[PDB]
Amino acid sequence: VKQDMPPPGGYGPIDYKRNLPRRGLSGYSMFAVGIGALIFGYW
Amino acid sequence: VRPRSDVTHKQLSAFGEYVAEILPKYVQQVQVSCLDELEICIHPDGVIPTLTFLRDHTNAQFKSLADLTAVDVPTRQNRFEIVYNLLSLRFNSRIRVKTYADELTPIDSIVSVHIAANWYEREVWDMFGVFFFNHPDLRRILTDYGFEGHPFRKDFPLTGYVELRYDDEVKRVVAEPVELAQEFRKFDLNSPWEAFPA
Amino acid sequence: MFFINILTLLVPILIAMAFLTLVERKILGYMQLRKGPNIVGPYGILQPFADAMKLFMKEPMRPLTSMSLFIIAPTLSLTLALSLWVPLPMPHPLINLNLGILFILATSSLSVYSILWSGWASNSKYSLFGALRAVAQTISYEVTMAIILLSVLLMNGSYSLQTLITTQEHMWLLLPAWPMAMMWFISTLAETNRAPFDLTEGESELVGFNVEYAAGPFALFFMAEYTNIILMNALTTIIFLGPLYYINLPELYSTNFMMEALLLSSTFLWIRASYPRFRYDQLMHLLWKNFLPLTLALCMWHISLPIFTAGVPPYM
Amino acid sequence: HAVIPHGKGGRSSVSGVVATVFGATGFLGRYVVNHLGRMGSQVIIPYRCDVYDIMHLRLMGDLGQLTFLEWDARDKDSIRKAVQHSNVVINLIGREWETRNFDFEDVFVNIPRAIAQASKEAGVERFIHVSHLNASMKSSSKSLRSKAVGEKEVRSVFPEAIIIRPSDIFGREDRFLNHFANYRWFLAVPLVSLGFKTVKQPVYVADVSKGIVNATKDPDAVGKTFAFTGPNRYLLFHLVKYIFGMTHRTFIPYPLPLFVYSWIGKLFGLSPFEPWTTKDKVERIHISDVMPTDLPGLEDLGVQPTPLELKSIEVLRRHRTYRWLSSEIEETKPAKTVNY
Amino acid sequence: TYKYVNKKEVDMKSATDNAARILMWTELIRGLGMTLSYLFREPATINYPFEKGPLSPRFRGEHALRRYPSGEERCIACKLCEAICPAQAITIEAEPRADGSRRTTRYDIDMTKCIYCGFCQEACPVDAIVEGPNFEFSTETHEELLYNKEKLLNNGDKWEAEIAANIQADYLYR
Amino acid sequence: ITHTGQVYDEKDYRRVRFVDRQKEVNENFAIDLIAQQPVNEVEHRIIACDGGGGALGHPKVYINLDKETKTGTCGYCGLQFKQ
Amino acid sequence: SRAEYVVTKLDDLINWARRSSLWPMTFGLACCAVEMMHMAAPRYDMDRFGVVFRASPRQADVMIVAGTLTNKMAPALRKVYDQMPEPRYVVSMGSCANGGGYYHYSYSVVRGCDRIVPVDIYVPGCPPTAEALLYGILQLQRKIKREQKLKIWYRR
Amino acid sequence: TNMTLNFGPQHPAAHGVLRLVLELSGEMVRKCDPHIGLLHRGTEKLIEYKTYLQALPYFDRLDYVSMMCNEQAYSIAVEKLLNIQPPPRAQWIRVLFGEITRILNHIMAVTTHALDIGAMTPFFWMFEEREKMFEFYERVSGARMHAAYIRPGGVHQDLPLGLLDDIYEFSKNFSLRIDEVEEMLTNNRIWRNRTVDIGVVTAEDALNYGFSGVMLRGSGIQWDLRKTQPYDVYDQVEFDVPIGSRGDCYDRYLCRVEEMRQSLRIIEQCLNKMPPGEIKVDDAKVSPPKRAEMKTSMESLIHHFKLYTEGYQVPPGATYTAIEAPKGEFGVYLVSDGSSRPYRCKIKAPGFAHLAGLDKMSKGHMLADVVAIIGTQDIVFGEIDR
Ligand SMILES: NC(=O)C1=CN([C@@H]2O[C@H](COP(=O)(O)OP(=O)(O)OC[C@H]3O[C@@H](n4cnc5c(N)ncnc54)[C@H](OP(=O)(O)O)[C@@H]3O)[C@@H](O)[C@H]2O)C=CC1
Ligand SMILES: COC1=C(OC)C(=O)C(CC=C(C)C)=C(C)C1=O
Ligand code: SF4
Ligand code: SF4
Ligand SMILES: [Zn+2]
């Protein structure tokens, strides 16, 4: 007799948006660590 | 009861006259059905002209061809009833233009008006046998390469006349006249009592 | 003895070659939320032996085709790949060759034929189209592959792979020359027709020489590819990642060679699952446009770094 | 006991012939089951080969038309149950290489007797026994002689049992035609008497099959010893070359004494896996086809023989090369017919 | 309401940022991280013979004919299960059993013809034909798949306990 | 053998099928099972027969057990009712 | 030492190798293909059992015909069946390919694939459940286990 | 013949069965003539011989990736002809399972696209989510796919007692699963290349060739039949059509990932606002009577017997009703005599039009490009072949 229905007060909220995180080492910093490695290696 | 919006029934009716006046020559009957749709019926010669007016008229732009089909009323002298359903993305609406074609009296092709029809017209030839003049490449699309007969015609047996099996002797697939192991049981379903039309 | 040293260095690699397919069909699995093959044997250890036996038993259909450029092709593929492990310098090598890297470069180059011969032998369109493209990127990649090594050698002093164990006693050649490592790694991915660069076995594209190859011939190339997959990774683990060498105990060299080779072998497995396959021209666009100008210029930098840094390497 | 024949004539129709066919897996057999299945007959195929091999026969039979029974020649009980519910028994049991556990007697005379013997006990209306053509009780090849021995015996176990006696058969998957064509591997193709004086008359497999089937459904054949022969005879020379002709492979007919050659057959015979040539085969190959003076087979039983050249192209095509694979028989030259 | 999925200065910081993205393959490394992450997640596969993928009561599975607790088969040959079968699978012919009652002499569901719609489950007034839970009835030969009354009645007897539980759970819904 | 005694016969050309494979027949044939069912005695002239369980039974019918001469039998369950 | 024993054991090995690693070549005609992609997918991993995700018409041990075998596709099915190795098998999947299914009486549908390719295991169900296919693939594995090719050679 | 080469029917790259007789000058495609009908099965003729309710299962099979959404189109069509409309709860259900089905189709289209491209891990990641969805179907209909749940007068049976809660847990998480695929393909330095600027279709040309789907939306034409011509209660929900610019394989993809996102927004609402009520019209004339009723009331048995044995008896007329199936506009032109069995039922397949465009899209393109474009049209040969 009971009918499956949304719970009282409604369900909670869902995410409908991409949550892709723009996380990265900044480019200059990235290149500097690399060039520094080659300089040490060459020496 | 469906939620009919008379607002529509009227506006589409009004367009139906509009088209009927604009092309007195080919429009034979124009009617707005209860579902609330509109169907302008045209002489087969008006295939090119009526479509083009709908594809390229500011007050009636019907850019895409939803479908091209051919019901087959065997009783009707002109057996096939080519039906073209068109959609207006701008004014938002749909109109169906339906013509009549007999087996050996071909209809013009509208591949020019809408290139969508390049395939559907091949589909109508393969299934029903109507021929479309000026078609770029009319050739069977859905049926087998060697199929004989047009299948969706009401006069074609469902099971058909040929079926395929592999024969060892000839080591190749081979047609044979259809022999079915349980024929389609043809239940008669119509009731001898009608329903007093509302 | 020397014969025993041929069993070792071969069998051991063949047994390991079999266990790579397994560690490929499980690492790709767990990355894709699936156990992979564990039901045959314990944890799938008997799985590689099982299909080997199925492959050899199934009919080696000879198409209605050459019969030699067809059987020479897998024999050549397995022969060159297993052969290139002969001079590899794990601790100390089996056959130490003074011009060792030229041996490895030359032997690799010969494998491109097997692809050409198999494609012509099949005599079906999918095979010929696949072979011509496959031969094209293999030799295209060979050109940067070779120049990248020449840059290395000039900082090693010799062509012998044994010298690098003495060159890399203080630092890996990745620190210096990392820019080429990456370019050696990507070229190692192309030359083993692995994923990012695998249009040859491209299935959606040309379902391709292996198309007509089934059972025993399929297996031999097959074996070849995977052994190569290891060998090239192992060459990365000697030329650029130099395992620590102690003259007193030679096996910690091989122990670390074991660890680095497995991880970089794991990496191309990980690359495969992670990336879509490049387009045929997109692949050559990379080598001739993106990498060859980088390699040729960095090649000159490696003829200059020695001279003006008064670091010309000691021959011998 | 019978089954009124209803239907239009194709698959999913009924003809009323329930027939045990013990050696169906064979080259001839395959064809026998084909027509029997096409006609709609009930076919019981006894088998001792593995189920994977028997699969090819499943598809030509309609649903429920083909029943497969496990059977062992040494075990009499297996033959007993196979013919329990059959009314027609066809025997095609034969081999060319005497196998370790089965001698020419067994495959030709011993077994084919027990079979018909039971068939009678069962009450099968008719039994068709197949023995090689020109089979004297004194013929050189043990095979042919032994086969002759059988056709006699089975009479006594089963009287009025039809005995079709086919010549070597021409068909795809046959030996007569493929064997010679496969001599390619051999650089030279030995031919006793340089392939002369052993005129041979091939017969298409189907013709043989159709004939056999027609026997099952005809009262005229009882105790008849038909001989399906062919539409044209041939000196072995043209045959060999013709074959090589369609195969488009060179021909070097080399004389080699049958004496020494019987030895070559012995060599292959020695091989464990299905010897390719058989001392007996060699002899049989040279045994000249006998002329026809017996109960007519084909045509007599209702099928007009089919010339060899007509279908040869299909049988020998697999043996051609990359390009030769595209040549057709009419641009090719058909070899001359020597009736002798 | 619409949305622009892909609708679109040059600064060293910006460019250097962009050039590093092309030169050291930064985004490619991002993708590798995702797959390494799952490698560490628990795999979702089930030991198929030992553990079975869950099917709730309405699963249609394999046809069975039920019987009354007394032992009288439920079907009374009204034959509308035949009428509504979309594939023409069920063939029923009937005659009055000596008892005088109405029963089916032959009830043949051709399972290869059947497309497991579950309408027969729906249509039966006595609910004699039910969609049984079992889905594992793969057969070596085509003939075995054709099912007569005796196989279905036998199928019904074997799975009656679960069929009764399943119908018990879902009948209020229907 | 079976319910309606299907007996592919010693001379049929179909009994060939069971060779080496058994036939599907039924124990506890239903023909006798309701006959084994006791006659449901009732007080009222007419009685119902939900088949037992309402929705899980048969379309309910009312049987007239009005003549002891005959025990009404619901056409659906074959259950005889003894007035 | 009795060769007979020696033979059985050997056969078994052979059977174990083919039965452990069956590389299926699937056609995906129709939809029952979607229910096989599910098998390949993580809940019911086909690979775990040694079945490879997919292979070409050559390197394939078993062909799973999923979906309607229409009259135009019927010549192809055969070709590909005929282009596979000497030890080959066919697992018909779907009522549309076991028999004719919802489209049995149509003019363009072959009433079953076993009219064009010999079929070894018939998996029933309109979308035969993926578990059911897995059951069907496992029954092919028991069918292979029982095959005794070398013992018949020895006893022949 | 410029080395004409049948793409071949058996090809992992060709979804289902597609012979693309292509003439390629080396690795460049000069002309693509797709062949169809390798899966024609007669669905349109068979329906004429079947009653309305026994033709409902055919629609699930027409394009079975999108199992239900197709059923809604026939439902709507049969409801219009009868001038009956489903009860309020049924409408929300159809939108609930209508959307779940859209996700299922997009997970199929995006992941199968990648498998042909060569990325294989996205398929396994999302097929597990698919699997979980199927289970919803099964616990609502009984079948994993090919349910037959949405019938011409509403749905067949109310949702099980508890489904809504689970269609929540899943929805609450699925997003992250779409997000992951993204971190794998949206910005891959390589996905973009093989997809960007491949198969660009102009806006005017897309309308002209009748594309009507994401393919139009991807070119920037704004048309979602769900917003322009609302069907069911897709009017009461609020979602954003994901329009695209620089239409190309990559842009449309992004659109399909965005509708996966927008459908989660529509599913959420449906769970939040689904009404208490009945799930089938109360006209025993069109909807079959409840089994307790047919077993206790004579008028209900008569209505059960006639409905199952004979049929609806739809009033004579004809209608073209189109919904927004995941692939594009799916429409049924159902001509109907007064009889219980239809007279014609042309199924408009978003896909017959899209394939035709393959020629005008893949011009001067490499063999690999053709593989990418068949993917960006989500061709399911069932709908095209019908
Ligand atoms: N051209 C020809 O082949 C000619 C043939 N004949 C006769 O016609 C008959 C049919 O010829 P063909 O089909 O080519 O012969 P095959 O060599 O093909 O063998 C026929 C069948 O007999 C079975 N068989 C063989 N030995 C035994 C045995 N010991 N126990 C049980 N079964 C056995 C074989 O089954 P399996 O292999 O599974 O054991 C095979 O399927 C032969 O008996 C032959 O004497 C006459 C003239 C010409
Ligand atoms: C989306 O359409 C597709 C199918 O239709 C259901 C397939 O069967 C198949 C074939 C399935 C396998 C597992 C090869 C593919 C590849 C496909 O893309
Ligand atoms: S409907 Fe139920 S009762 Fe009536 S016949 Fe079919 S099965 Fe027997
Ligand atoms: S069987 Fe049912 S599911 Fe498999 S294809 Fe035919 S219809 Fe689609
Ligand atoms: Zn009752």
Short mmCIF file of N, CA and C in Angstrom, two decimals, chain H residues 17-107:
data_model
loop_
_atom_site.label_atom_id
_atom_site.label_comp_id
_atom_site.label_asym_id
_atom_site.label_seq_id
_atom_site.Cartn_x
_atom_site.Cartn_y
_atom_site.Cartn_z
N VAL H 17 27.41 -3.74 -37.63
CA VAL H 17 27.73 -4.17 -38.98
C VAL H 17 27.67 -3.07 -40.05
N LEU H 18 28.82 -2.63 -40.53
CA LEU H 18 28.82 -1.55 -41.50
C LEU H 18 29.81 -1.79 -42.60
N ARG H 19 29.34 -1.98 -43.82
CA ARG H 19 30.25 -2.09 -44.92
C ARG H 19 30.35 -0.70 -45.45
N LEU H 20 31.53 -0.11 -45.38
CA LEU H 20 31.73 1.22 -45.91
C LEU H 20 32.57 1.09 -47.13
N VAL H 21 31.97 0.93 -48.29
CA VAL H 21 32.81 0.71 -49.43
C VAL H 21 33.58 1.98 -49.67
N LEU H 22 34.83 2.00 -49.24
CA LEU H 22 35.65 3.19 -49.44
C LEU H 22 36.82 3.18 -50.39
N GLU H 23 36.85 4.16 -51.28
CA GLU H 23 37.92 4.24 -52.24
C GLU H 23 38.96 5.17 -51.67
N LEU H 24 40.12 4.63 -51.33
CA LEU H 24 41.11 5.49 -50.68
C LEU H 24 42.42 5.61 -51.44
N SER H 25 42.76 6.81 -51.86
CA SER H 25 44.06 7.04 -52.53
C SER H 25 45.08 6.95 -51.40
N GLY H 26 45.73 5.79 -51.25
CA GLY H 26 46.61 5.61 -50.08
C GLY H 26 45.79 5.81 -48.81
N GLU H 27 46.24 6.66 -47.90
CA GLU H 27 45.54 6.87 -46.64
C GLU H 27 44.58 8.05 -46.70
N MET H 28 44.10 8.42 -47.87
CA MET H 28 43.11 9.49 -47.88
C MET H 28 41.80 8.98 -48.45
N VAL H 29 40.70 9.34 -47.80
CA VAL H 29 39.40 8.84 -48.23
C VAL H 29 38.81 9.71 -49.33
N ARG H 30 38.57 9.27 -50.46
CA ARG H 30 37.99 10.08 -51.52
C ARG H 30 36.48 10.06 -51.45
N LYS H 31 35.90 8.80 -51.26
CA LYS H 31 34.45 8.76 -51.13
C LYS H 31 33.97 7.65 -50.23
N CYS H 32 33.03 7.95 -49.34
CA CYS H 32 32.48 6.93 -48.47
C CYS H 32 31.05 6.59 -48.83
N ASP H 33 30.79 5.37 -49.26
CA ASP H 33 29.42 4.99 -49.51
C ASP H 33 28.98 3.93 -48.53
N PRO H 34 28.41 4.35 -47.40
CA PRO H 34 28.04 3.37 -46.38
C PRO H 34 26.98 2.43 -46.92
N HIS H 35 27.05 1.15 -46.58
CA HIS H 35 26.02 0.21 -46.98
C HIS H 35 25.14 -0.11 -45.78
N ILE H 36 23.85 -0.28 -45.95
CA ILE H 36 23.07 -0.51 -44.76
C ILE H 36 22.18 -1.69 -44.97
N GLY H 37 21.52 -2.11 -43.92
CA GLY H 37 20.62 -3.21 -44.04
C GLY H 37 21.26 -4.50 -43.61
N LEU H 38 22.47 -4.43 -43.11
CA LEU H 38 23.07 -5.64 -42.62
C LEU H 38 22.29 -6.06 -41.39
N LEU H 39 21.49 -5.16 -40.83
CA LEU H 39 20.65 -5.52 -39.69
C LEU H 39 19.19 -5.22 -39.94
N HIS H 40 18.77 -5.11 -41.19
CA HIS H 40 17.36 -4.95 -41.45
C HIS H 40 16.76 -6.23 -40.98
N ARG H 41 15.62 -6.17 -40.33
CA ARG H 41 15.04 -7.36 -39.77
C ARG H 41 13.56 -7.38 -40.01
N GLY H 42 13.00 -6.28 -40.48
CA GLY H 42 11.58 -6.20 -40.78
C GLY H 42 10.75 -5.51 -39.72
N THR H 43 11.38 -4.88 -38.75
CA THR H 43 10.63 -4.30 -37.65
C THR H 43 9.39 -3.52 -38.04
N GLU H 44 9.40 -2.89 -39.20
CA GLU H 44 8.25 -2.05 -39.62
C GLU H 44 7.11 -2.91 -40.18
N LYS H 45 7.41 -4.02 -40.84
CA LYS H 45 6.37 -4.85 -41.43
C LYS H 45 5.85 -5.74 -40.35
N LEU H 46 6.71 -6.23 -39.48
CA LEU H 46 6.27 -7.15 -38.45
C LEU H 46 5.21 -6.48 -37.59
N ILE H 47 5.40 -5.22 -37.27
CA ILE H 47 4.47 -4.47 -36.38
C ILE H 47 3.05 -4.46 -36.96
N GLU H 48 2.90 -4.43 -38.27
CA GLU H 48 1.55 -4.35 -38.87
C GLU H 48 0.77 -5.60 -38.50
N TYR H 49 1.46 -6.71 -38.26
CA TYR H 49 0.80 -8.01 -37.94
C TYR H 49 0.70 -8.21 -36.43
N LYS H 50 1.02 -7.20 -35.63
CA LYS H 50 0.94 -7.38 -34.21
C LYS H 50 0.09 -6.29 -33.57
N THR H 51 -0.46 -6.57 -32.39
CA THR H 51 -1.35 -5.60 -31.72
C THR H 51 -0.50 -4.50 -31.08
N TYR H 52 -1.11 -3.43 -30.63
CA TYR H 52 -0.31 -2.33 -30.14
C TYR H 52 0.58 -2.74 -28.99
N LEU H 53 0.08 -3.55 -28.06
CA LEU H 53 0.87 -3.88 -26.88
C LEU H 53 1.92 -4.91 -27.16
N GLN H 54 1.79 -5.64 -28.26
CA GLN H 54 2.73 -6.71 -28.55
C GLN H 54 3.71 -6.19 -29.56
N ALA H 55 3.58 -4.92 -29.88
CA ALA H 55 4.55 -4.29 -30.79
C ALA H 55 5.42 -3.37 -29.93
N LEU H 56 5.06 -3.17 -28.67
CA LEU H 56 5.86 -2.32 -27.75
C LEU H 56 7.25 -2.94 -27.62
N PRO H 57 7.43 -4.27 -27.37
CA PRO H 57 8.77 -4.83 -27.30
C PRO H 57 9.66 -4.61 -28.52
N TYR H 58 9.10 -4.39 -29.70
CA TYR H 58 9.92 -4.10 -30.91
C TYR H 58 10.66 -2.79 -30.73
N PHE H 59 10.02 -1.79 -30.13
CA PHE H 59 10.62 -0.44 -30.01
C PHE H 59 11.87 -0.45 -29.14
N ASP H 60 11.92 -1.30 -28.13
CA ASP H 60 13.09 -1.40 -27.23
C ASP H 60 14.24 -1.91 -28.09
N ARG H 61 13.95 -2.74 -29.07
CA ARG H 61 15.00 -3.38 -29.90
C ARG H 61 15.43 -2.49 -31.06
N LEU H 62 14.68 -1.44 -31.36
CA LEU H 62 15.02 -0.58 -32.48
C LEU H 62 16.35 0.10 -32.25
N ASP H 63 16.58 0.62 -31.06
CA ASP H 63 17.88 1.20 -30.74
C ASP H 63 17.88 0.84 -29.29
N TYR H 64 18.57 -0.26 -28.94
CA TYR H 64 18.61 -0.85 -27.58
C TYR H 64 19.62 -0.38 -26.57
N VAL H 65 20.47 0.53 -26.90
CA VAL H 65 21.46 1.23 -26.08
C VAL H 65 20.40 2.07 -25.40
N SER H 66 19.63 2.83 -26.16
CA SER H 66 18.55 3.61 -25.57
C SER H 66 17.29 2.78 -25.50
N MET H 67 17.24 1.84 -24.58
CA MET H 67 16.10 0.94 -24.51
C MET H 67 14.77 1.61 -24.29
N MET H 68 14.62 2.38 -23.22
CA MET H 68 13.31 2.94 -22.89
C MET H 68 12.93 4.19 -23.68
N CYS H 69 13.81 5.18 -23.74
CA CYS H 69 13.47 6.41 -24.42
C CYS H 69 12.73 6.12 -25.70
N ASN H 70 13.09 5.04 -26.36
CA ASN H 70 12.38 4.66 -27.61
C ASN H 70 10.94 4.29 -27.27
N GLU H 71 10.76 3.51 -26.21
CA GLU H 71 9.41 3.07 -25.81
C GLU H 71 8.52 4.28 -25.55
N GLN H 72 9.08 5.35 -24.99
CA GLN H 72 8.29 6.56 -24.69
C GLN H 72 7.73 7.11 -26.00
N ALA H 73 8.49 7.06 -27.09
CA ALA H 73 8.01 7.64 -28.36
C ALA H 73 6.79 6.90 -28.85
N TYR H 74 6.80 5.57 -28.82
CA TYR H 74 5.59 4.81 -29.20
C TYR H 74 4.49 5.07 -28.19
N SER H 75 4.80 5.00 -26.91
CA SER H 75 3.80 5.31 -25.94
C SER H 75 3.13 6.61 -26.34
N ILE H 76 3.87 7.71 -26.30
CA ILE H 76 3.28 8.99 -26.61
C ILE H 76 2.42 8.87 -27.85
N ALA H 77 2.94 8.25 -28.88
CA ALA H 77 2.19 8.19 -30.15
C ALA H 77 0.86 7.48 -29.95
N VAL H 78 0.86 6.33 -29.29
CA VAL H 78 -0.41 5.57 -29.10
C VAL H 78 -1.33 6.36 -28.18
N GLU H 79 -0.80 7.03 -27.17
CA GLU H 79 -1.63 7.88 -26.28
C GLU H 79 -2.26 9.01 -27.09
N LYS H 80 -1.55 9.60 -28.03
CA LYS H 80 -2.15 10.70 -28.75
C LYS H 80 -3.31 10.19 -29.55
N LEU H 81 -3.10 9.10 -30.26
CA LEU H 81 -4.17 8.55 -31.14
C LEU H 81 -5.41 8.25 -30.30
N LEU H 82 -5.24 7.81 -29.06
CA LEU H 82 -6.37 7.46 -28.17
C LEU H 82 -6.82 8.74 -27.44
N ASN H 83 -6.06 9.82 -27.55
CA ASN H 83 -6.38 11.04 -26.75
C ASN H 83 -6.47 10.63 -25.28
N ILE H 84 -5.51 9.85 -24.81
CA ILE H 84 -5.46 9.52 -23.40
C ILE H 84 -4.10 10.04 -23.02
N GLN H 85 -3.91 10.41 -21.77
CA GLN H 85 -2.56 10.86 -21.33
C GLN H 85 -2.22 10.12 -20.05
N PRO H 86 -0.95 9.77 -19.76
CA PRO H 86 -0.64 8.97 -18.59
C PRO H 86 -0.86 9.67 -17.25
N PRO H 87 -0.93 8.95 -16.12
CA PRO H 87 -1.22 9.59 -14.85
C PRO H 87 0.00 10.41 -14.42
N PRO H 88 -0.08 11.35 -13.45
CA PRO H 88 1.06 12.20 -13.14
C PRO H 88 2.33 11.45 -12.71
N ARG H 89 2.22 10.43 -11.86
CA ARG H 89 3.40 9.69 -11.36
C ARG H 89 4.09 9.03 -12.54
N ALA H 90 3.32 8.47 -13.46
CA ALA H 90 3.91 7.75 -14.60
C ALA H 90 4.71 8.74 -15.43
N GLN H 91 4.23 9.96 -15.57
CA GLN H 91 4.95 10.88 -16.40
C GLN H 91 6.34 11.08 -15.80
N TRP H 92 6.40 11.38 -14.52
CA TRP H 92 7.71 11.61 -13.86
C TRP H 92 8.59 10.38 -14.01
N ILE H 93 8.02 9.20 -13.86
CA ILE H 93 8.80 8.00 -14.00
C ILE H 93 9.46 8.03 -15.35
N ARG H 94 8.66 8.16 -16.39
CA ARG H 94 9.18 8.12 -17.77
C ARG H 94 10.31 9.13 -17.93
N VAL H 95 10.19 10.32 -17.34
CA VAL H 95 11.28 11.33 -17.37
C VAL H 95 12.43 10.80 -16.49
N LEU H 96 12.13 10.20 -15.34
CA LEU H 96 13.23 9.61 -14.53
C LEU H 96 13.98 8.57 -15.36
N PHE H 97 13.30 7.59 -15.91
CA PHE H 97 14.00 6.54 -16.64
C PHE H 97 14.33 7.00 -18.02
N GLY H 98 13.72 8.08 -18.44
CA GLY H 98 14.08 8.63 -19.73
C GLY H 98 15.48 9.16 -19.63
N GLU H 99 15.76 9.90 -18.57
CA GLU H 99 17.09 10.46 -18.39
C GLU H 99 18.12 9.40 -18.04
N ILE H 100 17.83 8.54 -17.09
CA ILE H 100 18.77 7.50 -16.77
C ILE H 100 19.19 6.88 -18.07
N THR H 101 18.27 6.71 -18.99
CA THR H 101 18.59 6.09 -20.27
C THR H 101 19.51 6.97 -21.09
N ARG H 102 19.33 8.28 -21.03
CA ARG H 102 20.23 9.15 -21.75
C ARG H 102 21.64 8.96 -21.25
N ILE H 103 21.84 8.95 -19.95
CA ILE H 103 23.16 8.69 -19.44
C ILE H 103 23.66 7.40 -20.05
N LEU H 104 22.89 6.32 -19.95
CA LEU H 104 23.33 5.03 -20.45
C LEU H 104 23.80 5.10 -21.87
N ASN H 105 23.13 5.90 -22.68
CA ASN H 105 23.48 6.01 -24.12
C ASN H 105 24.78 6.78 -24.22
N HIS H 106 24.92 7.88 -23.49
CA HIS H 106 26.13 8.72 -23.59
C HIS H 106 27.34 7.96 -23.08
N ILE H 107 27.18 7.18 -22.01
CA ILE H 107 28.31 6.37 -21.47
C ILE H 107 28.66 5.42 -22.61
#
